[PDB]
């Protein structure tokens, strides 16, 4: 678990992401794709995106970006109390999409890195350590729901 203090730090940065979701949304995804392009394969709609510039130009990617952050955000304001919110995503990932936990750690990486580039001064070690934990709590919870559904 995370302390109250840790949670506030997480939500304190979350607040800034919230000022430009679409924008934080696209950076995250561009970073993921770029750093681990094997993840692109889950996306057929994105398959065709050859450059950053085209990636940046897609409404579809930008939307997808917003859809990802809003879900993650609703989960974090739950401060660890997120089974209900969590459950649909674990189902879909265990059943439709088949996303490995590995894919999820990649994404965690892109998240942190974006936050740190955009928000240096609100994203110090304490905060960063706190966001790490929370993203870890999310992946862990996911991982077990997965097993329960027979995936991993
Ligand atoms: C912070 C982590 C993430 C969150 C909150 C998240 C959330 C979502 C949401 C809310 C959807 C739409 C409903 C559903 O199909 O579940 C979605 C769909 C999907 N997610 Fe994720 N996602 C995350 C990470 C990933 C990763 C890392 C991948 C694959 C590498 C991924 C692959 C997919 C795919 C392929 C779909 C189907 C979307 C479509 O084309 O209609 N998600 N994800």
DSSP string, 31-55: HHHHH-GGGGGG-HHHHT--SHHHH
Beta carbon of 103 within 6 Å of any ligand 1 atom: yes
Taking CA atoms only, the protein residue closest to ligand 1 atom 37 is 97
Measured CA distances, 80 to 16, 41, 71, 73, 137 (Å) = 20, 31, 14, 12, 8
Beta carbon of 110 within 6 Å of any ligand 1 atom: no
- Give resolution in angstroms: 2.1
Beta carbon of 70 within 6 Å of any ligand 1 atom: no
Rounded to whole angstroms, the Cα distance separating 140 from 123 reads: 23
CATH homologous superfamily for the domain 1-152: Globins (1.10.490.10)
**Residues in contact with 136: Cβ distance below 8 Å, sequence separation at least 6, in sequence order:** 108
Beta carbon of 108 within 6 Å of any ligand 1 atom: no
Contact 27, 35 (CB under 8 A): no
Rounded to whole angstroms, the Cα distance separating 111 from 28 reads: 6
Q: What is the DSSP letter of 97?
A: S
**Three-state DSSP class for residue 96:** coil
In sign, the C-alpha dihedral spanning 91, 2, 27, 21 is: positive
Contact 10, 131 (CB under 8 A): yes
Q: Which of 17, 67, 113 to mutate to test the pocket of ligand 1 (most atoms within 8 A of CB)?
A: 67
Whole-number Å distance, alpha carbon 68 to ligand 1 midpoint, is 7
Short-list 10, 150, 143, CA closest to 80: 10
Rounded to whole angstroms, the Cα distance separating 35 from 84 reads: 31
**Residues in contact with 2: Cβ distance below 8 Å, sequence separation at least 6, in sequence order:** 10, 79, 80, 130, 133, 134, 137
Contact 109, 90 (CB under 8 A): no
Domain ranges of the chain: 1-152
Contact 152, 21 (CB under 8 A): no
Beta carbon of 142 within 6 Å of any ligand 1 atom: no
Q: State which ligand 1 atom lies nearest to the alpha carbon of 108.
A: 1
Q: Which of 71, 75, 91, 146 to mutate to test the pocket of ligand 1 (most atoms within 8 A of CB)?
A: 71
Q: State the alpha helices, DSSP H only, in the chain.
A: 4-17, 21-35, 44-47, 52-57, 59-76, 83-95, 101-118, 125-148
Rounded to whole angstroms, the Cα distance separating 107 from 27 reads: 11
Structure determined by = X-ray
Rounded to whole angstroms, the Cα distance separating 2 from 26 reads: 28
């Amino acid at each position: 678990v995370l302390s109250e203090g840790e949670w506030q730090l997480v939500l304190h940065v979350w607040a800034k992401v919230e000022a430009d979701v679409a924008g934080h949304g696209q950076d995250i995804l561009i970073r993921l794709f770029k750093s681990h392009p094997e993840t692109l394969e889950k996306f057929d709609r994105f398959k065709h995106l050859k450059t950053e510039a085209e990636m940046k130009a897609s409404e579809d990617l930008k939307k997808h970006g917003v859809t990802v952050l809003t879900a993650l955000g609703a989960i974090l304001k739950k401060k660890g109390h997120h089974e209900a919110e969590l459950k649909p995503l674990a189902q879909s990932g265990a059943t439709k999409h088949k996303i490995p936990i590995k894919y999820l750690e990649f994404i965690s990486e892109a998240i942190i890195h974006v936050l740190h580039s955009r928000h240096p001064g609100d994203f110090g070690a304490d905060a960063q350590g706190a966001m790490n934990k929370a993203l870890e709590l999310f992946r862990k919870d996911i991982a077990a729901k997965y097993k329960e559904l027979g995936y991993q």
